[PDB]
Structures are given as C-alpha cells and as structure tokens.
Specification:
The structure is cut from a larger assembly and holds 9 copies of chain A. The first copy, chain A, has 528 residues and is an alpha/beta fold. Chain A has 3 domains: 64-245, P-loop containing nucleotide triphosphate hydrolases (Rossmann fold, 3-Layer(aba) Sandwich); 251-334, Helicase, Ruva Protein, domain 3 (Orthogonal Bundle), CATH 1.10.8.60; 354-525, 2-Layer Sandwich (Ribosomal Protein S5, domain 2). Helix content of chain A is 37%, strand content 13%. The first copy, chain A, has 20 helices and 16 strands. Chain A has helices at residues 2-12, 16-29, 37-48, 68-72, 79-94, 124-127, 144-147, 160-168, 191-198, 235-239, 251-270, 280-289, 297-316, 330-334, 390-400, 413-416, 436-448, 474-483, 504-507, 518-525, and strands spanning 106-110, 132-135, 174-177, 222-227, 242-245, 277-278, 324-325, 352-359, 362-373, 379-381, 418-422, 456-458, 461-462, 468-469, 488-491, 511-514. Chain A has a 5-stranded parallel sheet, covered by helices on one side. Chain A has a 4-stranded mixed sheet with strand order 8-9-11-10. Chain A has a 3-stranded parallel sheet with strand order 12-15-16, with no helix packed on it. In chain A, strand 15, helix 19 and strand 16 (511-514) form a beta-alpha-beta unit. The longest helix of chain A has 20 residues, at 251-270. The N and C termini of chain A lie far apart (96 Å). The complex binds phosphoaminophosphonic acid-adenylate ester (ANP) (3 copies). One phosphoaminophosphonic acid-adenylate ester sits between chains A (75-78, 113-119, 178-179, 226, 228, 257, 261-262, 296-297, 300) and B (196, 200, 202, 236).
Chain lengths: 528, 248, 149, 81, 48, 49, 149, 100, 50
C-alpha cells in the first residue's frame, strides 16, 4: 500500500510544488516505525493530499438556457440574483482560460432574514451541475476552524474549507458560507484573518493552510457568503467581496412563492399532496394581515399551520380536505389576526391623507391625519417619528402661507390655528423619509376644511417653493397601492425611470400622475 | 477492542459518507500504537460516532387520544400548543408511509415567566412517548458549547445537543432549549449564531458540528425553544421558529 | 466605481452570449439605466430654468461634490426667521448676516420699509454635506433672502 | 365640560387625530378583567370583532359589547347632562 | 427551579446533576432583580 | 459695526480672536443656543439679558 | 547623520490607487516591487514573533517580502496599518517601529532569525486609511501625504 | 532621605517640544531616553502583564520602552497619558498608577 | 546556549526574589524539549526577563 500511495501520487494530477514534498516525506516514511503517532499523522497527511481535490474537476455546463430553467423551478423572487449567477455563466462560458488571471468568483447575499440566501446553494449547484458543500460559520469563534492546526499537534485535522473539500470530492465546486456578520472572534486568532486568507484574489491561487502546508488552489471555486447585515461584517471582508443587497420580498411575489414553491413542499410534508387547495385571495390575505416581516419564513410557518390544521381536520375525521380555503374560512385555521390592513375607504375624510412609505418588512400604506383648531402659533408632530417629517411639515405650512388667496385661507391662520400631524410608525427613514406631499395635503385639508378623497395615492417630499423632491423604493409602495385596490398614485415627474422596474400586469391598473408641483397635487387631489 | 467496532458500525445503520469516514478513521486506528494520545482521541472519536444515533428511532405512536389525554393530564387549557401537538401527530400519522423530508418543527414559546411554556418539554416527552434531554442554554457565552470543538483540542466534546443525542440515544428526541432570549449577543461571544445552524428547518440535516464534524440528521428532532420576551431574541433567530405566542 | 464597471461589462457580456453581433458596442449615458437596475443616487444637475427666486449652493464632503439648492419664500407673517434643515445653525447665522445686509441696504432693490417684521421666513437646508468641512454658503442664502423679500 | 361619565361602562381604544378608533391587541384578559369587576358594558373598537371571536363563550354571554368607529359615538353615550 | 434542579446541566459536569434536595436561599431591592428571577424565587419581604 | 463685538477668549489653540454676533430678529423671545456653546456661555448670555 | 528620511503615510479612503503609486515609484527608481497586505487584524505577536522554536513559518513578513523581491533595496508597499491595533490580549504590540526607524534600520534583529539583518537602504511606503487608529509611535515622527478623493 | 521624588507632568497645546524637553533633560543629565505613546493600548493587562498561557504573549509597552533603553535609569517619557478613547475595556488607570 | 543566560543571571540577574522565578524557570527549562510549541513562551520569558 506504500507503493499504491506512490502510484496514487501521479494518478491524481497532483501538482508540482507538492510532489517533491510528498515523495520526500514518503521517503522519510518507509524507513521509520509505522506504529508511531508521528507515523499516524504522516499517514493521515498522505491520505489527505491524495484525497483532497487538486485538478480533477467536474465539467462546467456548456449552455446557459438549461440552467435558468432549473433556477426557475427552485427560486422565484430573486431575479437579480438569477441575473448575477447567469452573469457568472456568461463570464465562465465565454472565457474558458484565454490568458485570463485576476478572477473574482466571490459573491455575497445580505438581506432580511429568511429571504432565501441559505437555500441558494441547493439551487445554484443544481443549475450549473457542480457538487455542493454547505460550510458553516455560525458560531465559529477561533481562527483555527478554517486555518487548521499543525501536524505537531496530536489529533490534528485540517480546516473546515479543507474538510469541505473532503466531503465535496471534486475541485472547482461551489460553497455556501452560512454566516458572516455574526462570525464571532476571540483571542489567539481572529477568523476574519482566516477568511482574508480564503477570500482574496491575491491568495486564491495559493492558500497555505496550516495543516496542508503546501499551496492549495481556491481559484476555480465559487463562493456564497451569507449574512443579514453589513454593519457587523469585518470591514476587509466587507470591502473585497461583491455584495448583493437583497431587497425584501413583498406580496406580489409572495402570492407566486406560495402556490409555486412553498405550499406544495409542505403539503407534501403534511400528506395532502392533491387533497388541499388555497385561493390566491387567502394567500394575499395571509401576507397583508398575518405576516409582517420581509422574509417568507412565517409565510412558511403559517401556511404550514394551514396545512397541519388541515391535517388535524383530515385525521380527526375522514372527510375530504380538497375544499378550497378562501379568505373567510381561514380564520378557523389560523385564529386571531395578528396584524391589520390599511383601509383606503373611498368616502372623502375631512382631514386625512392617503399616505405611502415603506417599512423594511415590505411596502405598507400610511394614513396621515390632521386637524386645524383655532389656537396659537405652534405645531406638534405626535406620530412616533423624528424631525425629518417635522422639516417637511414646516416646508408644507410655509408653502401654504404663500398662495393664501388661491386656497381660501384667512389672513392670519399661522398665528391663529394650531396644527397637529399624525404619522404611522411604518415610515422608516434610511432611504425613505417619504410621504411629504401627504403632510402637505394634511395641512391643506385641515386648514381649508375641504375633504381629501381616498381615490388617489400619494408619495413625495416638500420643498418650500412648491416643488417636490424625489423618492426611492418606488416598487414596494406602488405594489402596496396595488394591494389596497387604489389605482391613482402621485409620483414626482423625475421618478419616471422607475416604471421600467414594474412589469405591465401591475402597471396596467396604476394610473400614475407624474406631478412635480404641490399646487398640482392640491388641484388634482383635494375635494371641494 | 477495535474488532467489535466494525460490526458496531455495521449494525449502527449509518449513512454512507459518515460510514465510510468512520471506517476510514477505524483503518487509521487499526495500525497505530494504542498507548498514544492519538489513540484515545481517535477512540473517543469512533466511540462518539457509535453512541450517537443514526437510524435508531423510537416508534412514534399515532394515537391522538393518548397524546391528548397525557397533555391534559400534565397541563390545563393551553389550547394553542395542545392543538399544535395533536396536529403535529396528525402530520406524522399522515406522512407515515410517504417518504418526504420530514423536518420536525422548531417551536418558540414566548409570554410572561411562569406560564409553563418554559418546562413544557417534560409533558411533550410524555405525550410523544419519546425520550428527553433538556439542554442548558441559559445565558451561554460559548458558541462551542453548542457546536463543539474539534478533536485537536484535547479533551473536546461535540456540544450539549450531541450530548443529548448521547443520553437520549434515538434520532427523534425532544430538546427543551431553555432561555433562547437570554443568549448573549456580542462580537466576542454570540451562541445565537450557533443556534442558527441547528435550528433551520431546511438544513438541520446538514448540521455539521466540530467533533463528529459530519452532517448530522436533525430533521426528526422536535426542538423546543423558550423565551420570556420577544425582542431580545436576535432578528435571524426569532424568524426561524414557530412562535406559539401564549399570553399570561 | 469599478464594482459597477464590473457589473456593466458583465451585463454587456450577458447579451453578448445570446446576441453574438458585438464586433463593436458603444454605451452612452442613455442606455446606462438598462444596466445596474435602479438609480442608487441622483445627479443634482442644472435645473434648466433661468428665473425663479432661488439659487444654487456648493459644498464638499468625502461622498463627493454636489450642487446644493438653498431656497426661501418670504411669507407675510410675524417676522420670525427659522432654518429648515438637519445641519448647523451657523447657516442660519449667515442668513442673519444677510438679513443685516438687507437691513443696511433696504433702498436700492425696491424693498418695503417694514420688511423685517412684515415677513415670516423659513430657510431651507435640504441636504447632508459639510458638517464642519466647508459649512458656509452665505451668499446663496443672501440671494435667497433678497429674491424672496 | 363638568359632566360625569356612566358608572357601568368601562372602555378601551386607540385615538388618532381625526377621531377614528383604531383597534387594539390582546383583548381576552382585558374583557375577562372587565367581567371580573362590576362592569357588564364595555366599549371596543369596531375591528376587534376578529379578536373577540377568539374570546370564549361565557365572557361574551355575561357582558355587553359596543363596536365603535368614531369617538363621537363614545361621547354620545357618556355625557349625562 | 425544582422541575430542573433534578436535571441541572452544568457545563463541566456534563451529566445532569440532582440539586432538588438543596435548600437554596438568596438575598437582595426588588427592582434590580430580573423579572423571571423575582417571579421565580419566593420573596420574604423583610422590612426595617 | 452694529452687531459685532471684538472679543478675547483663551483656547488650547493659544490666542484667538472673536466676532461675537447678535441680530435679535423678532420672534418668541427665547435665547437661541447657537454657535456651539459650552456649559457656561449660556450663563454669560443669561447675565447679559 | 540622517542617512534615511522619515517614512510616508498615504492616507485616504479605501479604494484609491495606492498600489498604482507604489508600482509607479518602484518603476521610477527601476526597482522590483513587493506588496505587503496586512489586511485583517494581522497580529504581529502571533505571526511575526515566532522566536524560531515553533514549526517556524513566516520568519517576519518583511523578510517574507525580501525573499519574494530578491533585491536589497525594494519598495515595500506596507498596507492597512490602521488595521493593526486589536482589542485582544497580546495582539496590539506595534512591533514594526523597530523595523521602520533609521536608528535601528541598519541593524535588524529578526523575531525568528535572531541575527542582525542588513536592512540598510530599504525604501518603505506605508499606506493606511484612517489617521486616528494609527499607532502613535509611528505617526509621531513619520511623514503624511493627503490623498483626497 | 527619601528615594522617591514627584514625577513631572508636561501639559499644554500638542507640539510644544515636550518629547524634546525630555530629550533635553536626557542630554543635560547624560542619561538615556525613550518615548512610548499610549492610547493605542486599551488594556491594563497588556501593560501589567497577561499570563503565559496565551501562546503569543508579548509583555507591556512601558517595559518595552524600558528594555529598549536597557539601562536601569532612563529619562522615560509617557506621551499621551490623557488622550485615551471611550473603550475602557480593561481599565488601564490602575496599572498606569501601579507602574507610577 | 543555556549558560549564557546563566552568565546573565550571575552578572545582571542580581536580586533574589527576582532571580528565584528565573531559577525555577531554569528548572522548568530542562523539563520539556526546546522544540515544543509551549517552550517558545518559556524561552522568551527569561530572555525578556534577562
Ligand atoms: N425564491 C424562493 N423560492 C423558494 N423557496 C424560497 C425562496 N426564497 C426563500 N425560500 C424558502 O424560504 C427559506 C428562507 O431562506 P433562508 O435560507 O433561511 O435565508 P436566510 O435565513 O436569510 N439565510 P440565514 O439567515 O443564514 O439562515 C428557504 O430555506 C427556502 O426554503
Ligand atoms: N398547565 C399547567 N399544569 C400544571 N402545572 C403547570 C401548568 N403550567 C405551569 N405549571 C407549573 O408551573 C411551572 C412553570 O414552569 P417554569 O418553572 O417557569 O419552567 P422553567 O423552570 O422556568 N424552565 P426554564 O426557565 O426555560 O429553564 C411548571 O414547571 C409547572 O410546575
Ligand atoms: N519652545 C521651543 N523652543 C525651541 N524649539 C522648540 C520649542 N518647542 C518645540 N521646538 C522644536 O520642535 C521640536 C519638538 O517637536 P514637537 O513638534 O514640538 O513635538 P513634541 O512637542 O516634542 N511631542 P508632542 O508635544 O507630543 O507633539 C524640537 O526638536 C524643536 O526643534
């Protein structure tokens, strides 16, 4: 078996900096005593170089169009991540090593928890037909989980990248790292230095892990690093790694994600494979009323609760569960409504405004309400938000002190009327301090006394001249307006580029008035 | 004593990659001096592969009425979680004979302290007639207290979840993980990040620890997680878990 | 920057592998939005209008250069002057210096006599650049106050 | 106003600035605590009927509920002069 | 807790330990005791 | 100058020069804590008023 | 008496062409070029200070630069020196002060080798982003060059 | 009579020659000099000394500055004894009094 | 090699409670082999002390 291992040196394709080291320590091996623990770690090392993959690679798939359909039967809502991975097929299909060095197959997914990004590795690997290992760095604390240990230590096995190479079998595989942002650290080694040693283009060609002291190749292997936030990444690994900021799943892909992918898996898990149906209206109801995070995890757990309450009905009595579950029988399955929808009741309320902003948990409507009472010259915003709505409120009222003859206001209303503004808590300013034109028509509906009809949705901000500021995150608030059955949404006119992100089945109902001026907002909206 | 270990592997009913890995480590352990510390760490390694279970499972009784009467003979009036247990049995009565990826779920029990949501796992063990090991996770600072150390660390253990796999001995236990809200979350220590591997219902069967260091099949473990408040659970970890929100 | 150049070259490569016609492919600014998805930030360019009562300020921050707008409307009220923004009050102090210049020069531009007390002023700061780097755009506010009043 | 309220009517709700009664959460122990003292007429918001159906039978058969949309419907009941 | 002092799982003492025979007595102000612990161990209100 | 005051204050930057500026625009009458004050300079402004 | 000049500090954001100016200055004096990464925390106590009685990998990373460059007067691109100081036990040491100062640049005792190395006439380029978390026994006497955006 | 005298505190704007004032006392005294600059070291237990169980345990910066002199009397400088950041993790005021 | 350090003890390791720690460190020096990974800390200990 010493000569069998000597044949298996040259049988593999095992490269030239490792070959004379393997032959010289095998030359050390046959003359010394085989019962030794030094002989044990020697035979472990010269099992490890001849089991780890070096150049024996799986065949890369020669065409894109049969991988996209395997992605289309595994994940739905990540179209941009699908474009980034067939983008990697477009890079590796065209090149195939035409004097090219300086590769970066190093990809990251950061988003809300439970959006998809640890189940990509059972889909990317099925797509481009490469074998998969799911490497875990959840509670990896020491550096030596990836860095390994020296062979002078008794009991030495290599790092978990090399143990991943032990399980996957072939070189050029795919990796999914499980957690990055809460990869913790201690003394005697920070594992961010170990992932520096993994994830550099300078040292993907050579690795030099501290068990296999020769260079190792991490070049052809493609990486997924999975995290939830960008704040607690170690800043070098945040720096020299390609980040995809995954946006949260909202309802108009959640209706598809249930019926296509998530519901049939768990009614296969329950047992009613063809013996349960759900309406699309109950799926839409579950998302607007029962789920309030951006991931589909309690979509999975409460449609799982629909499936197992249907199994409880199907086993306590033999009656058929092939009844379809609509909106109003769903409360027998799931009990109390945990959350409540937003009512765009189309009768004109006197001092209200149809507000739109976005939570990080999806696009959610607001209702900014305001009254004017003849008091003093002061204002008070009382809706659990900061001063970024307060400066828009002073912007709105100092717009409305101009054009006083236009809207029928009294001559001294600023020092005569107290004005109070309520906002809901769903407006979260990190990119969206939104709904400024809702504040402006709340001031205009309070002071004039003329009602605001609820037929028209609104999104903007206020400059004091009478012009509007643009907004981001336009997709989730337009489909949140499409959720409530309200079809007339006000946008700034310079937000015309965001209609290309919306496909036509949502866009055919949404009567988008691209409106740049606040006087045009108050002329289009405010019911006399 | 290595010549018992081969047929202990063969009647243990291991899966094929971990079975070939344990037989390869047994071929390593055949040749060496048995007095070495490598011999005792590989002997502890093969021993820990044998007395963890792989295909040994207690039979789940499919009686809804026996489970309901044991749930009513230990607890009163906890209607959501008692309906949850009988519909978990209604899943497992229906899927018995259908080979699907049977992930037993991850229950979260929030509410005020003292409801009995925090020591329900003894009654859950009596109601399944499955074996029990409540796992101490009260304010743990150590991530390798959950996922273990490697065997290069000299007196290493695979964590308390695999120690529950020892002392239960079958592949479908109930684990009362106490005080999941009370885990410290910091850059120096965060074992809630170690809870994210072992409590994900699509990849618990690819749980790698650090001492067995193989994908261990944790689809059939009926995990129980407890908390006295909602918000101090980390934002990945509360998302993973069936929150049976039972109030005061 | 070179991350987004990486993404536009590979987005060119994706339609290269399904349409192989590219012996030459020129990309100007108009088909840039076909790549890279949503516009992340927005260019504060020239507003292309010659005459309305506001001006264009400047600032400098390590995010880069920008073309700030400072605007004010002189509403007929109590004579208060307040800032509207989440930056420092030295911008309002430079506005106060502009107020002393218009009180010292109330004749040559057709101002009313009691303009200091017959006009409420709110002064906009829409922005986030210059915390203490270059935190003064005082003649922009002086044109804003004089064109408002 | 110098006017007292009714003695058998306890109440719960949420206020917005127009006067629309927003619904509340966790009502079962609130209704049975109002049932526990000498109150058998409670004010609820209008859209807490979905929470009130989860509340059991003896709580709904002992007391009286009032589904309220606007706070003028509250103050039409509880101002004795 | 007497439901799990019989199965108290120490980090070093890996096998669960029996502590339910042990008379634990604790000392203290209520407000800086945590909420599960002040609900969990029997208060003896000793004033001045 | 009608509002400026040529002042002297000791700094850890050595000797410094001041332009103490006050306009007092008509409003609610409160003292505005402008110009990045310390814990004592509002007390000096209260002594002035 | 001042045979060696004080050493630079390129400061700026992460992403500027500090490697491009290092390759330019090594092309300027007609010199083979080495880049020193020092990317993570890079504990000099753990990885420089071996004292030769381990297995003995990386005998000082300056000497690992020297065996790669093969010439006695290279341009060392020292990078990310602001990332040196750690919040751990023995890991902040600032042991490159003995490397960089001219009063013991001519001699150089190594952590591994324990032999006085001739590190005379060795040019150094130190590039580090944020000026605050530099070790102060470097920037008390090193030069600094502002590279803005 | 008493071997210990009080210890100098130089304080002012940064850069008024205080390191060179210690160097000029070193040149007048014909005695060696070292300057350490604190603030980067965030630990008492770095300076006072961690135990030998840690595998890369180098000792403190103040005895590093004392051993770089190599003589039992240095004109020792403690630069930046006040400018310490908010992360007072292992509190170095007790060790910096206990070396003083 | 281990006698140049003792030359440094009886030339500049003069005080007795200081040198008692170095003497039982010298006792520990011939206990393990000087190629073990623990012995780096032990040799660095009395080199830094001496
Ligand atoms: N597009 C999709 N199609 C089908 N199933 C999906 C899709 N997105 C999510 N899922 C399912 O929802 C689950 C949530 O994804 P998950 O892998 O938990 O992401 P993640 O939690 O953010 N990564 P991590 O936080 O480290 O666990 C997946 O395991 C899938 O089962
Ligand atoms: N429905 C019930 N029927 C009978 N006894 C009950 C019931 N609910 C609660 N109890 C009792 O009240 C106790 C409350 O549990 P508790 O002691 O708080 O758990 P715990 O010790 O806190 N577990 P943990 O804090 O997670 O480690 C139970 O252990 C029972 O003794
Ligand atoms: N009062 C002084 N008279 C003459 N020369 C001076 C004086 N103060 C400083 N210098 C010069 O400045 C040098 C001292 O360096 P300097 O820039 O002051 O830093 P430092 O004060 O010594 N250390 P630090 O105070 O911590 O920044 C001396 O070598 C002189 O060349």
């Amino acid at each position: 078996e010493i000569e069998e291992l000597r044949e298996r040196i040259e049988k593999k394709g095992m490269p030239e900096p490792v070959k004379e080291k393997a032959l010289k320590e095998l030359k050390r091996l046959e003359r010394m005593q085989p019962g030794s623990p030094e002989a044990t770690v020697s035979r472990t090392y010269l099992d490890w170089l001849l089991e780890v993959p070096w150049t024996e690679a799986d065949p890369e798939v020669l065409d894109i169009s049969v991988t996209k359909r395997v992605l289309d039967e595994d994940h739905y809502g990540l179209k941009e991540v699908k474009e980034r991975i067939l983008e990697y097929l477009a890079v590796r299909q065209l090149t195939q090593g035409k004097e090219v060095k300086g590769h970066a197959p190093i990809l990251c997914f950061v988003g809300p928890p439970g959006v998809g990004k640890t189940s990509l590795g059972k889909s990317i690997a099925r797509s481009m037909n490469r074998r998969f290992h799911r490497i875990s760095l959840g509670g990896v604390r020491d550096e030596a989980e990836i860095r390994g240990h020296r062979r002078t230590y008794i009991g030495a096995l290599p790092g978990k990248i090399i143990q991943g190479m032990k399980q996957v079998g072939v070189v050029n595989p795919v990796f999914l790292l499980d957690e990055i942002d809460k990869l913790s650290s201690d003394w005697r080694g920070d594992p961010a230095a170990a992932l520096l040693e993994v994830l550099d283009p300078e040292q993907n060609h050579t690795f030099t892990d501290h068990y296999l002291d020769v260079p190792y190749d991490l070049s052809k292997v493609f990486f997924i690093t999975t995290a939830n936030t960008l704040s607690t990444i170690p800043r070098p690994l945040l720096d020299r790694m390609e980040v995809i900021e995954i946006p949260g799943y909202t309802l108009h892909e959640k209706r598809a994600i249930a019926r296509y992918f998530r519901w049939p898996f768990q009614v296969k898990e329950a047992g009613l494979e063809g013996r349960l149906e759900i309406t699309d209206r109950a799926i839409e109801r579950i998302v607007q009323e029962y789920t309030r995070e951006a991931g589909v995890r309690n979509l999975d757990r409460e449609l799982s609760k629909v499936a197992r309450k249907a199994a409880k009905d199907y086993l306590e009595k033999p009656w058929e569960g092939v009844r379809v579950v609509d909106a109003e029988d769903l409360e027998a399955y799931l009990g109390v409504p945990k959350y409540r929808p937003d009512r765009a009741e189309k009768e004109p309320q006197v001092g209200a405004a149809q507000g739109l902003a976005w939570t990080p948990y999806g696009g959610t409507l607001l209702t900014i309400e305001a009254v004017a009472v003849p008091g003093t010259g002061k204002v008070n915003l009382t809706g659990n938000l900061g001063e970024v709505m307060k400066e828009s409120a002073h912007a709105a009222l100092t717009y409305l002190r101009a054009h006083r003859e236009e809207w029928g206001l009294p001559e001294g209303f600023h020092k005569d009327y107290d004005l109070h503004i309520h906002v809901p808590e769903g407006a979260t300013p990190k990119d969206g301090p939104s709904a400024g034109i809702t504040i402006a028509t709340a001031l205009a509906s309070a002071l004039t006394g003329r009602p605001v009809r609820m037929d028209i949705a609104m999104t903007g901000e206020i400059t004091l001249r009478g012009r509007v500021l643009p907004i981001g995150g336009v997709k989730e608030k337009l489909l949140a307006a499409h959720q409530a059955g309200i079809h007339r949404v006000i946008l700034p006119k310079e937000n015309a580029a965001e209609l290309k992100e919306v496909p036509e089945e949502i866009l055919k109902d949404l009567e988008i008035h691209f409106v740049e001026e606040v006087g045009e907002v108050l002329k289009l909206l405010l019911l006399p």
